[PDB]
Amino acid sequence: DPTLNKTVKIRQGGYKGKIGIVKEANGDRFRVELHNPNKTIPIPCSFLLIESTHGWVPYED
Amino acid sequence: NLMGKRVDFSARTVISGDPNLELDQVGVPISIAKTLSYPETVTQYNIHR
Amino acid sequence: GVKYTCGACAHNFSLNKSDPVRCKECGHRVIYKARTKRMIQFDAR
Amino acid sequence: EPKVNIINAQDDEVELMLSDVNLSLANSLRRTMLAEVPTLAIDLVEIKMNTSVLADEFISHRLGLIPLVSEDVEEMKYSRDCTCEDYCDECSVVLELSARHEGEEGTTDVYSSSLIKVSGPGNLNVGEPVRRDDYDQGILLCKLRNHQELNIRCIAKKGIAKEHAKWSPCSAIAFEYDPHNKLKHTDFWFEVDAKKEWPDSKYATWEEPPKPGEVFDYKAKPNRFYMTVETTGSLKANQVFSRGIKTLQEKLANVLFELENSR
Amino acid sequence: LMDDDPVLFNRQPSLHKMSMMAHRVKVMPYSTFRLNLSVTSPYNADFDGDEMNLHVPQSEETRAELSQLCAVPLQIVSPQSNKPVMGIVQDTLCGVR
Amino acid sequence: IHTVMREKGPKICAELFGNIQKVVNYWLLHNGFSIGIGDAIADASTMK
Amino acid sequence: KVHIGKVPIMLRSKFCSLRTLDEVDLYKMKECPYDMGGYFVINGSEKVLIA
Amino acid sequence: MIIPVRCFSCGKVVGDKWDAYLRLLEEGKQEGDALDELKLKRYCCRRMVLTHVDLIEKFLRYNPLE
Amino acid sequence: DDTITTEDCWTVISAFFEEKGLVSQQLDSFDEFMETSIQDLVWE
Amino acid sequence: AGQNAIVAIACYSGYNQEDSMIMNQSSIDRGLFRSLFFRSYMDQEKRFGISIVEEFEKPTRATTLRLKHGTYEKLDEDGLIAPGVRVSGDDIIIGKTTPIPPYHTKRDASTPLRSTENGIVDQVLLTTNQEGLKFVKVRMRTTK
RNA sequence: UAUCGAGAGGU
């Protein structure tokens, strides 16, 4: 998958506005390693923005 | 190594009291409950579960 | 390549891994990595 | 039937007597003011530079505790309910801080007054770091020495103290009733004489002591509740008491809605 | 591991058989094992740093031995002195007086 | 406890602990109980 | 003057390079003024002798 | 390390009173009276200022590492 | 004169630690080893 | 080495029997008994022959066998992670290889963060040892 | 994902 280990911002949910890294993206349900507290959370891939060449891009990267 | 030995499916942590648990219960942290496992045989009655 | 900082004189510089490990300014051989390019967030709780 | 008597008042504390209500209502109001009255507070800190002797999250924790003006926070949305991506101008206030020490000598003390509001849901009065006077530097945040720098960008969000105590508008809430123990709700510990050994309520002169003959009124209930609401300045004391009543109402209203929908 | 799974629970030193009793799991947040206060006595457990051990049976046969022989309620009376080894203690005993 | 065990069996007897605990701990939560330095102090006559 | 070996120096003793200096230069040597010595540094590890 | 922003027990802000407290002590006031003047009425709040130790002054002596 | 008080006793004790500190039995012992014992041991 | 806590000796909800204790969550929120925790990891390059030495680097999968299972994507080109980066257990924080005796010629000798720990990289020391080979320390910080 | 030891600790 092309978005593992890439930095992410969360746009929905209780973790909205928080930075993270895609630790595991098996399918549809991703595991983002939050930066702020030491915990890796389950989150749907729809909830993520990925960083790319120009700003934070949804899962069209 | 023979009269006693180290074993799989074991766990250990600090203990606390709970006034709201039954006498025969043990409260188990989620992280421990996700590391330990039980091998349940698949039958018609539990395959969906 | 990678930014460092001299533990004695605080000069900032880069090294291309093959360079010897010392400060160009004072020759000190104890140096420290500079902070990450990445943004850091904290929850203020 | 509810009655109110404001004993004293000022910006950050109101002393008042509350009467002709149930104990449970005075207590639920006490709890609501402590735990569920929204305020605004820093909840996300973007550290672009921190070469001070303090750790990033050490500083972030102090930032969250800085009281911010929350007067218009009721018209502001929660981040979790806002349709935007990341934070935005309708659900957050952005503050920025930048400090530096130039000079080879001395120490620069960084205060909460150097927090500069950059954006926010205009023209709502929310997001300014609370100040006592006009010459008030506010809360000490950090200290800097030659070449040490602090450059942070803060996102402030609406929240309640159930989530984190930094969103509470109160400090203590003094609260008492029956200063002469006529109701017999407490049984006093003593060595020789209970009356001489226990101090007087500060509201002892607001009710009359029991007469030496008086029989025990086993039907009396608590009915006069003296309380003082102190705040941190994010909200004025009268605002906390008013919004406490409002918040407890919406909570009961939502329950009533759900019952009338279960039909 | 899931609610009501039988597990063997144990505090050292394992001086007698009710140092190892079978409990019903209740999965809970936070990182401690939780005990009803009335089982502290047979374990000689308290909460000043004590730790305890949990073992998970791996078959229908060993689950049944735990639930039908070792379970806490089966252990309330011990053959040591033909009397109970568990009672009301601490807050509940102070309070019941 | 000994009697309920013999008379009602281990299941009922195990519930007995929980029942007693839940009533008493509630009552004690709302009654309170403490101890302080004062409880070590005998009066001046007894000290003499 | 033939060299017969090296002897580990107890910090803050009379033969330690820290005995002079004084708080100003202690701070420059990254040394804490609350550290009273009485121990050695052997391969980076602080070792104390037990009476 | 540095004066806490809030009283741990009640939440009252005390992080804006550290300089004023040191100043009252220079002016010769006794600690109890200085706390009284600062309107620190509850003893939880008084403990915060009375027993704080300003260690950041010690940490600053260590010549910055950049 | 007058009587030596408890506060005076603590004045004496402060003087002890002012001169000796807390680890002087470590430092003085090692100092004697460098000053004298190595030399004497060689001449044994 | 401690804090002045406001303490009630009381039976409250029964969650402090047998030497446990009830702590005020709001006091914790405001900083009570909070602490920093630091762990330093040390590694250095070893010599096995005249020109056979270990090397700090981010090891490429094509040339190095027995890579660790954790991520190597937080390592810089010098084989070291940079301060400010969040790390979780088994993440690689020091990349190091050892050559294989006589393509695909090196063997992994990297250091993962301890599996039971997490936090933020606080400081990274790079230097040489008494023998002239490279020598590193990685300090991790978290708040408990 | 080493082995052999040592030391300091927890109930």
Ligand SMILES: Nc1ncnc2c1ncn2[C@@H]1O[C@H](COP(=O)(O)CP(=O)(O)OP(=O)(O)O)[C@@H](O)[C@H]1O
């Ligand atoms: N060295 C040791 N060897 C074996 N078991 C030990 C031990 N130290 C402690 N224990 C275990 O821990 C128990 C000690 O409990 P403690 O907490 O040390 C004292 P107590 O008698 O329960 O309470 P007290 O502190 O009120 O006197 C022993 O009875 C035993 O169960």
Ligand SMILES: [Mg+2]
């Ligand atoms: Mg114990």
Ligand SMILES: [Zn+2]
């Ligand atoms: Zn230099």
Ligand SMILES: [Zn+2]
């Ligand atoms: Zn928004």
Ligand SMILES: [Zn+2]
């Ligand atoms: Zn207080």
